[PDB]
Enzyme design. Structure first.
Site, PDB file in Angstrom:
ATOM      1  N   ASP B  71     -41.517  48.834 -34.048  1.00  0.00           N
ATOM      2  CA  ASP B  71     -41.162  48.240 -32.766  1.00  0.00           C
ATOM      3  C   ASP B  71     -42.127  48.466 -31.609  1.00  0.00           C
ATOM      4  CD  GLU B 102     -39.684  43.683 -28.868  1.00  0.00           C
ATOM      5  OE1 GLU B 102     -39.866  42.513 -29.273  1.00  0.00           O
ATOM      6  OE2 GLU B 102     -38.900  44.480 -29.420  1.00  0.00           O
ATOM      7  CG  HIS B 105     -35.398  46.954 -29.242  1.00  0.00           C
ATOM      8  ND1 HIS B 105     -35.703  45.772 -29.885  1.00  0.00           N
ATOM      9  CD2 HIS B 105     -34.359  46.672 -28.416  1.00  0.00           C
ATOM     10  CE1 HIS B 105     -34.885  44.820 -29.466  1.00  0.00           C
ATOM     11  NE2 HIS B 105     -34.059  45.341 -28.574  1.00  0.00           N
ATOM     12  CE1 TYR B 109     -33.523  50.661 -34.570  1.00  0.00           C
ATOM     13  CE2 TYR B 109     -35.468  49.669 -33.566  1.00  0.00           C
ATOM     14  CZ  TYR B 109     -34.257  49.543 -34.227  1.00  0.00           C
ATOM     15  OH  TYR B 109     -33.763  48.298 -34.525  1.00  0.00           O
ATOM     16  CD  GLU B 163     -39.847  39.860 -32.499  1.00  0.00           C
ATOM     17  OE1 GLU B 163     -38.752  39.861 -31.903  1.00  0.00           O
ATOM     18  OE2 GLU B 163     -40.652  40.814 -32.434  1.00  0.00           O
ATOM     19  CD  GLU B 197     -36.363  42.755 -32.575  1.00  0.00           C
ATOM     20  OE1 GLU B 197     -37.402  42.431 -33.199  1.00  0.00           O
ATOM     21  OE2 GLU B 197     -36.389  43.328 -31.468  1.00  0.00           O
ATOM     22  CG  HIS B 200     -37.220  38.950 -28.829  1.00  0.00           C
ATOM     23  ND1 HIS B 200     -37.503  40.296 -28.825  1.00  0.00           N
ATOM     24  CD2 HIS B 200     -36.616  38.689 -27.644  1.00  0.00           C
ATOM     25  CE1 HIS B 200     -37.089  40.828 -27.687  1.00  0.00           C
ATOM     26  NE2 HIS B 200     -36.548  39.874 -26.954  1.00  0.00           N
TER      27      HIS B 200
HETATM   28 FE   LIG Z   1     -38.193  46.375 -32.138  1.00  0.00          FE
HETATM   29 FE   LIG Z   2     -38.082  41.627 -30.726  1.00  0.00          FE
END
Ligand SMILES: [Fe+3]
Ligand SMILES: [Fe+3]
Ligand SMILES: [Fe+3]
EC number: 1.17.4.1
Lengths: 279, 286
Positions: B71, B102, B105, B109, B163, B197, B200
Site C-alpha cells: 500500500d 492510501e 491504509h 495495516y 487496485e 480500493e 480507486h
Molecule cells: Fe492500500
Molecule cells: Fe487504493
C-alpha cells in the site's frame, strides 16, 4: 546524501509503526485534525457585502483572489519523494490534498463574486501577465530547480513560499475583517492562512533535522529576496492603499513575518521590524 | 500525446464551471468517504487473535505483512505519475485524495500488525518474506509501469490491476473471517479499505474511458492475466487460503471473476467467464 536522516534510504521503515519521529507525526495528526472542504464555507450572505464595496475595493479583492487562483509542483513531486521518513511523507500527502482545497475555494469565491464569465477572463488576462507571477516563477528556478540547489536551500525556499509569499494578502484580507466585510472570504481566509502557517512550521521542523544546513547568508538571501517580491506586489503593483491600508505599514509586516521565519529557522533577525498590525 | 487527459490545455485559473462532471463526481464521492485509522476499534481483536489456531494466525499475519509492504509503494505510482502526468484539474484532485487515503491504509495495516504481532518476531522474521509474490509483483509493475517503453494507456490498466485485483483475494479472505464472525476490527477496516480500493479501481476505468489511444485488448489482457496468475500463485501456494478454511479452487475462481469484471469495466470482453463463488461477497458499505 545518505549522510542525511531525512533523505537516508534507510528511513523507509518496514511499514510504519511504531512512530520514530513523534514530532513530525504530531504535525501530521494536526493536519489530519484540521481537515476541511470548500463546501464547508458558507458563501450565502456574501453578495450583499460584496456590493457594499467601492470600485477600487472590488478591483483589489478580485485581483488578489485571481493571483491566489494563479499560483496553483514542489510538494507533489520533490519533497513527498526525496524525504524517506514515513511520518513526513504522510504530512506531505496531506498538504497536497489541502492545497487542492485552497484552489477549489478560490475558484469558488471568484465564481460567486464575479458572475459574468467574460469579466472573469478580462481578469485573468491581466493576472498571468503581471510581474509578481513571473518574479516568483523566476525565484523558484534560482532556488528550487537549479542543480546547485542543495536540499537545505529548497527546505528554506519551501518555508518562504508557505510563510513569506502571500503573507501580505492574508493580512490584507484580515484587514477587511476588521472592517467586517465579506464573512465567507474572511472565514476561508483564516482557514487557509492557518494551513499555510502549519505548512511553514513543518518546513522549519524539516530544516531542524538537517545535518547540512545552508549558510545563514545563503538563507538571508532567499528570505529577503522573496520579501522584495511580496513587498513590491502590495506596495506598487496592487497597492494595498486601494483598500485603505498603509503601503508603508505593509512593507513592515512582511519584514516582521520574514524575521519571524529566520528566527524560527534558528538564525537571527535582519530587519528588526516590529509588527505594525494588531490582528 | 493527443490526449485531453495529458494536454496542458487542461484548465487555467478557475476550475468552475466544471468541465468533467464525470471525474468531479468521483472526487466528491471520495471526499465523502473520508476516515481515519483511529475510527476503527481494535480492542476486541487481541482476545480473538489468541483463540485462533497456529495456521490462521500464520495466514492472517502474513497477509497483513504483504498489505503493509505494498500500500505504501502504490503511492510512488500516484504521486510521481498520475497526480502529475494528468492535467485535467478534476483528476488531479481525485489523485490527491487517493494519496491521503492510501496513507490511512498503511497506518491501519501497521496498527493491525503492531496490535497482533506482540514483539519483533515481526520486524525480524515476519518480514523476510518480502516470497515470489512481492518479487513477481515488482517485475510485473516495473515492466508495465516504471518502464519508458510503456505508454500511458497501459499504465492506467496496470493501475486498475493493482487496485482492482492484486489484493482482491485478501479482501475476500478477510470477508471470510467476517462470515465466521472473527476479528471485528480487522474485518471492519477491511470493509472500509476495500470500499476505497473499489472507488480507486472505478476511477482508473473512468480515466481509461477518456483515453484516446487505448492499447489492444490483447495487451489490456496480457497485463490483467499476468496479474491473476501472480495473485492466484500467492493465495493457493504461498499462503493457501485453506489455512483459514477456504476452498482454493473457489478462491482461484473469485479472482478470475474479478479480473473479468475489470475487463468489462475497461469496455472489453471476458476471458474467464468465471462466476462469483462466494455468496458472502454481497455486503454493506459497497
Ligand atoms: Fe492500500
Ligand atoms: Fe487504493
Ligand atoms: Fe500550503
Amino acid at each position: 546524501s545518505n549522510e542525511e536522516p531525512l533523505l537516508r534510504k534507510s528511513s523507509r521503515r518496514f511499514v510504519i509503526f511504531p512512530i520514530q519521529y513523534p514530532d513530525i507525526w504530531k504535525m501530521y495528526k494536526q493536519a489530519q485534525a484540521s481537515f476541511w472542504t470548500a463546501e464547508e464555507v458558507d458563501l450565502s450572505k456574501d453578495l450583499p457585502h460584496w456590493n457594499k464595496l467601492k470600485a477600487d475595493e472590488k478591483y483589489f479583492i478580485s485581483h488578489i483572489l485571481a493571483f491566489f487562483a494563479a499560483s496553483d509542483e514542489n510538494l507533489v513531486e520533490r519533497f513527498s519523494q526525496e524525504v524517506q521518513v514515513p511520518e513526513a511523507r504522510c504530512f506531505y500527502g496531506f498538504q497536497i490534498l489541502i492545497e487542492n482545497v485552497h484552489s477549489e475555494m478560490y475558484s469558488l469565491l471568484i465564481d460567486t463574486y464575479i458572475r459574468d464569465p467574460k469579466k472573469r477572463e478580462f481578469l485573468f488576462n491581466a493576472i498571468e501577465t503581471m510581474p509578481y507571477v513571473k518574479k516568483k516563477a523566476d525565484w523558484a528556478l534560482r532556488w528550487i530547480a537549479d542543480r546547485k540547489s542543495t536540499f537545505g536551500e529548497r527546505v528554506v525556499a519551501f518555508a518562504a513560499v508557505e510563510g513569506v509569499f502571500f503573507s501580505g494578502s492574508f493580512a490584507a484580507i484580515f484587514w477587511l475583517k476588521k472592517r467586517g466585510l465579506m464573512p465567507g472570504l474572511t472565514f476561508s481566509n483564516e482557514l487557509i492562512s492557518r494551513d499555510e502557517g502549519l505548512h511553514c512550521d513543518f518546513a522549519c521542523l524539516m530544516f531542524q533535522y538537517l545535518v547540512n544546513k545552508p549558510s545563514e547568508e545563503r538563507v538571508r538571501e532567499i528570505i529577503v529576496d522573496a520579501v522584495k517580491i511580496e513587498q513590491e506586489f502590495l506596495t506598487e503593483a496592487l497597492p494595498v492603499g486601494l483598500i485603505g491600508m498603509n503601503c508603508i505599514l505593509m512593507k513592515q509586516y512582511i519584514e516582521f513575518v520574514a524575521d519571524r521565519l529566520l528566527v524560527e529557522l534558528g538564525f537571527s533577525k535582519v530587519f528588526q521590524a516590529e509588527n505594525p498590525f494588531d490582528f
